[PDB]
Each structure stands twice: as structure tokens, then as C-alpha cells.
From TrEMBL, chain B:
PROSITE patterns to which the protein is assigned, alphabetical: 4FE4S_FER_1, 4FE4S_FER_2
Listed Gene3D superfamilies: 3.10.20.600, 3.30.70.20, 3.40.50.1780, Fe-only Hydrogenase (Larger Subunit), Chain L, domain 3, Iron hydrogenase, small subunit
Domain 4Fe-4S ferredoxin-type: 196-224, 225-254
SUPFAM superfamilies on file: 4Fe-4S ferredoxins (SSF54862), Fe-only hydrogenase (SSF53920), Nqo1 middle domain-like (SSF142984)
List of residues binding [4Fe-4S] cluster 2: C214, C234, C237, C240
Binding residues annotated for [4Fe-4S] cluster 1, in chain numbering: C204, C207, C210, C244
Organism whose genome encodes this protein: Clostridium beijerinckii (Clostridium MP)
Binding site for [4Fe-4S] cluster 3: C350, C405, C549, C553
Protein name from the UniProt record: [FeFe]-hydrogenase
Keywords on record: 4Fe-4S, Iron, Iron-sulfur, Metal-binding, Zinc
A GO molecular-function annotation: 4 iron, 4 sulfur cluster binding
Coiled coil: none
Length: 618, 621
């Protein structure tokens, strides 16, 4: 178990400090009379002391009152447990107490402390209350409830200092803030964090210029703010700030805490484009596929199952190719109710982009969920059920190249009973930092395989990560099954290339399809304006918010050298992965076919709609 | 018990008990060669003329019939062993989600008491079904719910070795309705109270009466054209509903839900009732306006099946405990030179001022008290204290509020007054709706024997009871606050200045060294006059009361229509509340022993942290 911001995973007269102190470790503590942290190297950044837990399962809870005055050594309660989690002002009390309660509940559930069984349910309710607070679904009554629960527990455990009572006493203001203002001042509660420009804004106006939809108003050097109603979460502003004034959260600490929670099942998915960029932080060239290094590293961190978003992309193609074929058949049949083009793209940014500016084209996009959310729902409603786990007993973490995927995973449509299909997102950069600080070097770690049932993927799925790949995959499947012919050359070079707005004409048998591809939302605006004006007609379109597609996402490591060359290199790495696959059509993936044969029975069925489709623009 | 009809009536061989959406529920003698349609016709058809939707056979177990069985000889073999031979007929006016929630909950109760042991194995599964249905009725679902239900259905059908599980057929036959509920958040029959909004329906003729009645000018439309409500500015004052010559404006009706909950075995149902109900309901049963028939209401509610009868006036006493404290605090801070403080303080249980202030008086958001309404204070206490004391989780108690207006429906629907999808007030029934339930169920308040209200949350003072008429809220708060600020007990506790009937009233109360200027408005136009005068500085007030209805709550839109002169009847009801007040030994809220017990045992004193956590809310978040 370990914990620190900027990351670490730390795997008599001895203690174990793993809080917000720089340099986590065990250290041999001297017996001389505030600077104890200093002996551990101070706290991350220079954040002031908040508290220090003694013993992870249970001990004492120390607050500021012990800071500049004699820290009685022996007050480490006899059940010291030889570990200390030190808190700074950067740690949210709600999140920490959730982690504490879950650790205690796990050790109860495994028999380690049966003397606490009598209070098991009570503590569980505490967690539930805490969870509701972190999810923003609470009133102030929760405090009342917590207090009584605290009072109850301390009665049966006979304690003179009950942690929850003191938490209420000392951090009432933070809790009230969370509940009434729906605000977590440390931004650890990912479900209370919005993309926001903070006080470090200098009014340089870079974000205003960079925003493709002009989401930011504000003049001179006056603080700028994001008009969340039109924000596409494309993340251009975050990359453009001369400072760190724009924050969209960082779930690193949540990931570490979950990994350190005993008997908690943590599974991961990873976006197609991550595997060709992450290795750059460890000496690989752009485009080199290091997915097996990622798998081994994630397992070393403690991940119990490593899957792949490209599997979900194959499932997405099953649905989207089916819908494209249906729309084409209706169009050719003279049904004027149908709408063309059909948009196929896993990028959330088009949603807000279309609703606010192309409200005559709400019937264009496919109803299929993204590969990330398709994977997530299948993992919790089928795989976990298969393994006899309820959805809350599985923590599904998505490693993605984008902040927009954080926003998507936070959407309430992709959740049930306050359990989010994607529990949270970790970006490529954040994972790089986790690996770096935990001593995991992807260059030197031994390869490991991704887990099969939701990890196998075709080249159609993998090319999702670069511009033109989604529509290429969907077209592969749809044209091949509409013609009955297997293509000798399955690659559609017309859909490749790098122009911001690309037009392609694909001929297969009697079928002729006109395709539009845009990467960069301004080029997308050009293409959609052309569609509306009738200057051009399209059967299908792909829209990507980032130049180059997902390989150019804002959550990816900053490129080294020539930017365009590096992005093209990553895209061609995805294309080379595709060329190296035996299976290059999504409908060939045996595991996705198993999904259809055993649960959903065929694409566009009622069950398939219920699980794998959603309603954009409700 | 069992029973149902939309005019609502809990009706406590070759004989069947028909209790669906058929006119004339009852026990009927089936002719030999008879279809289902013939049985329905012998019961007089369905309420209104709605077409047949379905028919449940046997309350726990039987079959589920659709249109396909209507013109087909009713074979009695569907009445298998000990089915009790009952049929619940559904019309197109019944929501399938609500009915299946009732069915599943009934089956779960019959399992839970051991009479149906062989189904215990599916208990959890059936429970999950209910949860799914509940989530659908509350609008917190995705389409995945259907998937889940299907598998649960299959699971049950596997574990019971049954050839036809009802839920599978439900999905098959009403997929469109279920999908509507989930994706469109729409219950086309409007039985799901958490999906109903106040809307003008298609039966609107464009007469424009509602537009004229609206105090905030919230309704648009001309000539025969359908009128529309700008829901963003609507105060839910309910004037439009009262003005409509037709039934074009609908705000839901939880009557059937109330009946189903009453018919569910071993389900704890408790009620609170607003002060103004008891002086108006009796008008429907031969009493004069202003006559207090609260004990008749208690007996009638118990006859319907209510397990505990409490009183909103108790919550009004608790409200005064909090609000008098806040008023005293603000006065003391004002006298000390606190420019931090804001006056007046608004004390009123009426929801309508909230949006009214938010939409037009945004410089006065710090004016209203942070205290909840009496209804919601009762609700939080009932579920978080009373139910807890009796070893019941909040979902094991169904708390029903009997109120005179649709604005209380809107308040009970607010998400702030809920936790984990449990609403503190499960739903509201109006005085009119309860009148119709009594009338159709054979409960006559004139001839029924009196019964007492339950004690712990039913005892109340005259200060609490006068809440139901204009000027009463501020009168009660003033009683308590002035008495405790002066240390003097008043010889005459009535403040005649706060009484009267003018739309905008000004009063000056003198007690010891204290001098308070009070403004009272009933009718939101009068409220606007008074708040404009406050804003211009033309008048100054220490505290104000705002009521949306003329005369206060006794004049609510959910009350029975008055007979004779409207104003005279409303004044009669208000004076009935005043006479109840005069008949009470305790006439200050701070004397109520049960409210004081709340403070002594749980919250420790008004305006404490615990009291804020439970009895206060944030209007204008
Ligand atoms: S870029 Fe960063 S700093 Fe420059 S204005 Fe936008 S936010 Fe403020
Ligand atoms: S994210 Fe993309 S859209 Fe939202 S503000 Fe920053 S730039 Fe404009
Ligand atoms: S393109 Fe790929 S990366 Fe850029 S935003 Fe859309 S999804 Fe995130
Ligand atoms: S009153 Fe009823 S009918 Fe006349 S306009 Fe308003 S709604 Fe339409
Ligand atoms: S309720 Fe009151 S406010 Fe809302 S519309 Fe009808 S009248 Fe206007
Ligand atoms: S006054 Fe009483 S009745 Fe009229 S609306 Fe406000 S609360 Fe409902
Ligand atoms: Cl683990
Ligand atoms: Cl995705
Ligand atoms: Cl493999
Ligand atoms: Cl980048
Ligand atoms: Cl199947
Ligand atoms: Cl069943
Ligand atoms: Cl009952
Ligand atoms: Cl009330
Ligand atoms: Cl009690
Ligand atoms: Cl309503
Ligand atoms: Cl009594
Ligand atoms: Cl009336
Ligand atoms: Zn937090
Ligand atoms: Zn419904």
C-alpha cells in the first residue's frame, strides 16, 4: 500500500509514512522532541498539515492540535499498525474517510477483526453516506445521520475518540461545502469537479483564441470563464494555458487508494491510441505499440484484470455498421424519413458541438454508445455478473487520452443507482506519472498479455485511435456484408490522410458511398456547413476533435520534436497494428460474437439497444 | 381489503371480485357463456370510456390478460388452486409501471410473512425487479433496466419452473410504454407522480381564463389557440387550475397510489394533514365552514387503512420553534448595528413565494427564513426519528400529506426533501381527493365516530393551527419571539393587527421595549405590491408573511369549492382556525411538549447544527 500526490506505491521504533509527505517510506524515527514531516521531507508542494491517521485499519486520528506542541510519541496507540497516512490541505476529507471505511470493511469482511462484526452494517451506512456526499446527491441531514452512526459505533467499540465524531467536529465546514455548494475544495471528488478556469488566470486570452466554438468570453486581462453550456470538452484550452489555471481534476489518488484497498476488484480498459504514445515517456518511438508493457505495469500496480477498449470498439462497429447498412438500405428504398449522413465517432466533443450549433442534424449521429461505455456496461452487467459480482464490487478504470472521456464517464446516463459504468478515467499523462514515481519502467518490464474475454480486438477496432479509423472500420464491415464480397485490400487509403476536411468515394459492387472526415472541430464546422448548404452530400461522416484523432489527445504526453511528424507516426503505428492483425474486420472478433450469441442475440436487437445504445440530445 | 376505482373505493361457484378501472367495482355473478368484455360491461364498463388494457387474475398469482382475451370465453381454469377468484381490470388510464410496482410489492409482502414459502428462493430477484420499477417511476433509469428485468424475469421463471412469467409478457406487450417512461421521462397516464409536471392539456379551448388569473403572467396564448405554461417562472399557486372551465390543466392525482399502498399488506402508512383541511373538508359532509372535524378525518383515515394519523400543526409548532429563534436573532443583530443582517425576515409555509422571489426579487434572496415548511419538518422527523425509534427504515414508512393545494405537491416532489430516492413526503393528497375517496368508500364524516390523532407528532398549539389562514404564521412566530424577548407573558395573545382580510396589511406590534413593523400579503399581486414598496423604501418591515391564496391555506385550490359567498366562507374557515386557537390551553408553539422533546432528545435547541441539518434547507441554492 502507498499514497502520495505526484504518486508513489510503497510496496519496535519503526513507523511507515505514506501520506502527503514527500518520499514515502518506513524511516527509523528519532526520539527527540512539527518538523517530523521534515524528517520525511515535508509535505508534497508545501501544503499545510491537515491530519494524520494512526494505523490503517484502526488507531487514532491526529489533527492540527498536535502540530507545534509535544507530539507524544507513545500516543501512537498500542495498535499503531506501524503505518501513518499523513494528510495535507490537498486531500479531501470525504475521500479519505471513504478509503478508511472501505479498508476497515474489507478487513471485517475477511475475518481479520470479528470484534467489529457487530458494527459492520453501521459502518457500511457511513460509507454509503460518504459516497452520496462525494456523488453530490445529499442534503445536510447526512451529517446528522453520520453523527448518530458515529455515536452508535463508539458505544459498542467503547472508544474515547471516535474518528467520525472528530471528523464532523473539525472539518464541518468542508462537509457543508460538499453538500450545500456541491464543491470539493481539493477537487478529489471527481463527480463534483467541472472544467474550470481558476484564480491563476492572468487574462492572456490564449484560451479564447484556441476555443473552436468560442466558449470563453472575457476581455482585457479580466479573468476568463468557460460557458459550460456550449463547452465541448475538447481540451484545447487546457493545453493552451501559459499557466495551470484550467483544472479538470486528476483521479490518480483515487486509483491508488482503490488499488490499496484489500479484496477490491480493479479492472482497466485502455483506449486504442494510448499504446502508441505512452512508451514515449520511457524511450520508445512514437507509434511503437507497448500495450503488453502497459498490461504488466498495471498488474504490478495491483490491477486484477487488464482489458482493452479496442474490444469495445469492435462491438461498437458491430452496432454502427448495422445501423449504417440499415440507413443505406432505407435510403436506396426511397424512405425519405431516413437521414444522411450517419455520423460514426467515439469522440464526445461532437455531441455538444452539434446540439448547440447544428440542431437540424440531431438525427445524423448513430445511437451507439462509445467503445469506452460499451465496454463498461458489458463489464458490469455481464462479465461481473458471470463472475458473481455486483456492479459496485467491480471498479472499472478507463485509461484514455482525453479530458472529454472524463466528462463522458461522468455523464449520468452511463450509470445506474449512482454506480457509474466507468468509475473514473486516468489519462495517459497521469498513468505515466504513476509509473514514473512507482519505479515502473515500461522499457525494462517484461511483457504480459491482456486478458482475453474483453481484450481481444481486430485492426478495425485499433484504427479507432486516429482520424478516419472509425468510419473505415464501419465501412469495412458494412460494405463487405452488403456486397457479399471479401475485399482483397481492406485498407481504404481515401479515409486516411491528414487534411482537416477529407472527402472519399468508396465503390464496392453496386454500392457507392461518399464519406466525409474531419479532425479539428473548425474543419468539422466547415464540413457540417457544407452539408447544410447542400454544397456537398455525404452518406457517412466522422468527426474528431483533436488533430490526428485520439493519438493527438490532450491527455497524451506532449509530443517531442516535430508535432505533425509525431502525430502521424502514432497514427501509422495504429495502422501497422491493424496490418499485423489476422482479423481486420470487427465482425470477426470471437469474443464480441460471443456477446451477441449469448446475451444480445444480434446487432440492433432490443437487448443490444438497451445495453449498447443511448439517447444523445434527449 | 383489496379495492380500486378511479373515483376510488377500497371495497373491503360463479362469483368474482372485480376491482379494476371498471365503473361499479364489486362482486359479480358471471353468466355461463361470458367473455371478459361481457363481465366488464356487467360492471358498467371502465371509468370514463377508456379501452381495456389488461386484467390481472389472482392478486399474488394467476395470469395476465391483454386485448387478445377480451372477446374470448372466460375459462375459469385460470383460477387455479386457492386463487380467491379476483380480477383487477386495467384501462388505458392506468400506468403499467405503477401497477407492476404494486403487484411486485404485494407478492413480496406475501412472501415475507411466510404464507408463500415456496417463492422465498426468488425473493431477492423479485425485490430487484421492484427496485428497477421504482427507478423507472422516479426517472433515474436507462434502457438497461429492461435488459435487467428480462433476465430477472427469466431467472424467476427458471427457479419456479414456470411456463409463463408475468414480467416477460409485460415487457413484450408494453415495451413502448416502458421505453417512453425511461427515454422520454413521460408517463402517458400521469400516475407516476415524479414524472408529472403542471401542464395544460389538449382539451384546452383557448378561453384565456388561466392567463388572466396568473399573478406572474406565466401563461401565453391567444384566441382558440392552446395556452402554455412557462414552467420556468411558475409558482404553482394553482390559480390557473381553479380558473379553467374544463379539465385542461392537470397536476397529477395520487389517489390510486394511496389506495394501492393502503391495500398492500404489512405496509406502514402514516398521514399528516394541513391545518386548513380540517375546517373545510366537513363542508362536503354537512358541516358548516370553519367547523373543526379533525377527529372525523382521523377515524375515516383509519377506516381506509392508515396505520398512524399525525398532524401538520405539530410540524408548524416545530417550524415556529426554529423561525421565532431566527427572527429574534435577526432583530438582535439589527439592533446591535449588524449591516450583515437583512430585514425583513419572511415567515411563510407557502412554496409559491420561492420562485416568486427568485424570479422577480433577486435582491431579496436573503429575506426568507431558512426553516423548512411544517410539512417537510414533519416528514424528516417521521422518517429519521420516529421510524428509526420504532425500528423501521425510511423506505418501510409511507408518509402521506393531506394538503389544500398543488403547491404542496410540487414541494413534496422537490429533490432536496429526499434521500436515496426516498422522498420525505411520499406524496400529497388534496382535500378534494380525500373527499372523493371517502365518498366512494362509504366513509361519512357526519356519522362516523370520533377518533383521536396520534400523540407524538399530532399534538399542536393554537399558534400552530392559525398557520392555515392569512397572517397566522407571523402571528405565531411573533407570539413566541416577543414573549421571549420581553420575558413577559401577554394577557391577550391575539394580535388583531395581523388579522383582517386586506390584500396588503401593515401592523405595528409593541411589547416592552420592542417595536415591530409587520407586513402581510395574501394573493401574489398583493405580495408584489408589498415587496415593491419594500424595495422603493416607501415602507420598512421587520418581518413579512406572504400567502399565495386569498385568505391563506383555507382558500387553497385543493379545498372543496365554497358554497354561497366565496369570501364569507373563506373568512368562516379562517375564524374556525382562530376559534380552534382560542380553544387550546397552549397558544404558543414553544409550549408544545412533543416538540420540546424533539429538541431535548435529538436537536438540543433551535438553530443548532442538528436542527439546521434536519429542519432547514437552502431555498435559492
Ligand atoms: S489561457 Fe489560461 S491564463 Fe490565459 S486566459 Fe485562458 S485561462 Fe487565463
Ligand atoms: S474545452 Fe474546448 S470548448 Fe470547452 S472551452 Fe476549452 S476549448 Fe472551448
Ligand atoms: S478525439 Fe479522441 S482524444 Fe481528442 S477528444 Fe475526441 S476522443 Fe478525446
Ligand atoms: S383555462 Fe383551461 S381552457 Fe381556458 S385557456 Fe387556460 S387552460 Fe385552456
Ligand atoms: S400556477 Fe399560478 S403561476 Fe403557475 S401558471 Fe398557474 S397560475 Fe400562473
Ligand atoms: S397558500 Fe396555503 S394553500 Fe394557497 S398555496 Fe400557499 S400553501 Fe398552498
Ligand atoms: Cl488489488
Ligand atoms: Cl471510446
Ligand atoms: Cl491474448
Ligand atoms: Cl499531444
Ligand atoms: Cl440470449
Ligand atoms: Cl414474477
Ligand atoms: Cl394498512
Ligand atoms: Cl406546511
Ligand atoms: Cl419520536
Ligand atoms: Cl406538480
Ligand atoms: Cl391526543
Ligand atoms: Cl376553495
Ligand atoms: Zn471531496
Ligand atoms: Zn408511469
Amino acid at each position: 500500500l502507498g499514497s502520495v500526490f505526484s504518486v508513489f506505491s510503497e510496496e519496535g521504533r519503526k513507523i511507515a509514512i505514506c501520506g502527503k509527505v514527500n518520499n514515502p517510506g518506513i524511516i527509523e524515527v528519532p526520539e527527540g522532541a512539527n518538523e517530523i514531516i521534515q524528517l520525511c521531507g515535508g509535505l508534497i508542494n508545501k501544503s499545510n498539515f491537515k491530519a494524520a491517521q494512526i494505523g490503517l485499519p484502526f488507531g487514532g486520528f491526529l489533527t492540527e492540535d498536535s502540530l507545534d506542541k509535544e507530539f507524544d510519541f507513545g500516543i501512537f496507540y498500542e495498535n499503531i499498525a506501524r503505518t501513518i497516512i499523513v494528510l495535507s490541505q490537498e486531500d479531501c476529507i470525504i475521500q479519505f474517510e471513504k478509503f478508511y471505511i472501505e479498508y476497515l470493511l474489507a478487513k471485517i469482511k475477511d475475518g481479520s477483526y470479528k470484534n467489529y462484526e457487530v458494527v459492520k452494517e453501521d459502518i457500511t451506512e457511513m460509507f454509503n453516506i460518504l459516497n452520496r456526499i462525494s456523488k453530490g446527491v445529499s442534503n445536510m441531514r447526512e451529517i446528522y445521520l453520520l453523527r448518530n452512526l458515529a455515536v452508535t459505533v463508539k458505544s459498542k467499540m467503547n472508544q474515547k475518540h471516535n474518528i467520525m465524531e472528530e471528523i464532523i467536529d473539525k472539518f464541518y465546514e468542508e462537509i457543508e461545502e460538499h453538500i450545500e455548494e456541491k464543491k470539493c475544495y481539493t477537487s478529489q471528488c471527481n463527480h463534483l469537479v467541472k472544467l474550470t478556469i481558476t484564480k491563476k488566470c492572468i487574462g492572456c486570452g490564449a484560451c479564447k483564441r484556441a476555443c473552436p466554438v468560442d466558449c470563453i468570453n472575457g476581455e482585457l486581462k479580466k479573468k476568463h470563464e468557460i460557458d459550460y453550456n456550449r463547452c465541448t470538452h475538447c481540451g484545447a484550452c487546457v493545453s493552451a494555458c501559459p499557466v495551470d489555471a484550467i483544472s479538470a481534476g486528476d483521479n490518480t489518488m483515487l486509483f491508488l487508494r482503490d488499488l490499496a484497498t484489500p479484496n477490491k476488484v480493479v479492472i482497466t480498459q485502455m483506449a486504442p491510441a494510448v499504446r502508441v504514445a505512452i512508451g514515449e515517456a520511457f524511450g520508445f518511438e512514437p507509434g511503437e505499440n507497448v500495450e503488453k508493457k502497459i498490461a504488466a505495469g498495471l498488474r504490478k500496480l495491483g490491477v486484477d484484470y487488464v482489458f482493452d477498449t479496442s474490444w469495445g470498439a469492435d462491438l461498437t462497429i458491430m452496432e454502427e455498421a448495422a445501423e449504417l447498412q440499415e440507413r443505406l438500405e432505407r435510403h436506396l428504398a426511397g424512405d425519405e424519413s431516413v437521414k444522411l449522413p450517419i455520423l460514426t465517432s467515439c469522440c464526445p466533443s461532437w455531441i455538444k458541438f452539434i446540439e448547440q450549433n447544428y440542431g437540424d442534424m440531431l438525427d445524423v449521429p448513430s445511437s451507439a454508445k462509445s467503445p469506452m461505455e460499451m465496454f463498461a456496461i458489458v463489464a458490469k452487467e455481464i462479465w461481473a455478473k458471470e463472475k458473481g459480482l455486483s456492479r459496485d464490487e467491480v471498479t472499472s478504470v478507463a485509461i484514455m487520452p482525453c479530458i472529454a472521456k472524463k466528462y463522458e464517464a461522468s455523464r449520468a446516463e452511463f450509470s445506474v443507482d449512482m454506480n457509474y459504468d466507468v468509475d473514473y478515467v486516468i489519462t495517459t499523462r497521469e498513468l505515466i506519472k504513476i509509473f514514473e514515481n512507482s519505479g515502473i519502467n515500461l522499457k525494462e518490464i517484461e511483457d504480459e498479455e491482456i486478458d482475453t474475454v474483453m481484450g481481444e480486438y481486430t485492426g478495425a477496432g485499433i484504427i479507432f485511435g486516429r482520424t478516419g479509423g472509425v468510419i473505415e472500420a464501419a465501412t469495412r464491415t458494412a460494405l463487405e456484408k452488403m456486397t457479399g464480397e471479401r475485399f482483397d485490400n481492406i485498407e481504404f487509403e481515401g479515409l486516411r490522410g491528414w487534411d482537416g476536411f477529407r472527402v472519399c468515394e468508396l465503390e464496392a459492387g453496386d454500392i457507392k458511398l461518399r464519406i466525409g472526415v474531419a479532425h479539428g472541430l473548425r474543419e468539422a464546422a466547415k464540413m457540417l456547413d457544407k452539408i447544410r448548404s447542400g454544397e456537398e452530400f455525404f452518406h457517412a461522416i466522422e468527426i474528431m476533435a483533436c488533430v490526428g484523432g485520439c493519438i493527438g489527445g490532450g491527455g497524451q504526453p506532449k509530443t517531442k520534436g516535430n508535432k505533425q511528424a509525431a502525430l502521424q507516426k502514432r497514427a501509422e503505428g495504429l495502422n501497422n497494428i491493424d496490418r499485423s492483425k489476422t482479423l481486420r474486420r470487427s465482425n470477426e472478433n470471437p469474443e464480441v460474437l460471443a456477446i451477441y450469441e449469448k446475451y444480445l442475440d444480434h446487432p440492433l436487437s432490443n437487448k443490444a439497444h438497451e445495453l449498447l445504445h443511448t439517447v444523445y440530445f434527449p
